[PDB]
């Protein structure tokens, strides 16, 4: 299902509890429209891909996660698996989430 990260502590725990399924992270700003404007897609895949783990991060209130990931543009899609990174891509591209997930699925 989906899982919100409020601090770096929940970040690592998210990957550990994410099991071995894919893990896509949405680095969108809650106060920014253009970023949150794409949540109806990323979060929607939650019901279309119940076999995938989706996370959420606040690049403004969780600068700790964005700092470690050095995010400089939102939304930033980052893919993790077993606590390891396998791919990543930013830019409003909700349709790409489909091809990317089916790729490293």
């Amino acid at each position: 299902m989906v899982k919100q990260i409020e601090s770096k502590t929940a970040f690592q725990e998210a990957l550990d509890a994410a099991g071995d399924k894919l893990v896509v992270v949405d680095f969108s700003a809650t106060w920014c429209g253009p970023a949150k404007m794409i949540k109806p897609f990323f979060h929607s895949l939650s019901e279309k891909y119940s076999n995938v783990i989706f996370l959420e991060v606040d690049v403004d209130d969780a600068q700790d996660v964005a700092s470690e990931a050095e995010v400089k543009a939102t939304p930033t899609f980052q893919f993790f698996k077993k606590g390891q990174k396998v791919g990543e891509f930013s830019g409003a591209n909700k349709e790409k989430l489909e091809a990317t997930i089916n790729e490293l699925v």
Binding site: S28, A29, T30, W31, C32, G33, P34, A35, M37, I38, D58, V59, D60, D61, Q63, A66, V71, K72, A73, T74, P75, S90, G91, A92
Partner: peptide, 13 residues
């Protein structure tokens, strides 16, 4: 305040 860098969502085009 909660501000950081630019949001290149559907803002580019």
């Amino acid at each position: 305040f909660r501000f950081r860098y630019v949001c290149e969502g559907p803002s580019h085009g």
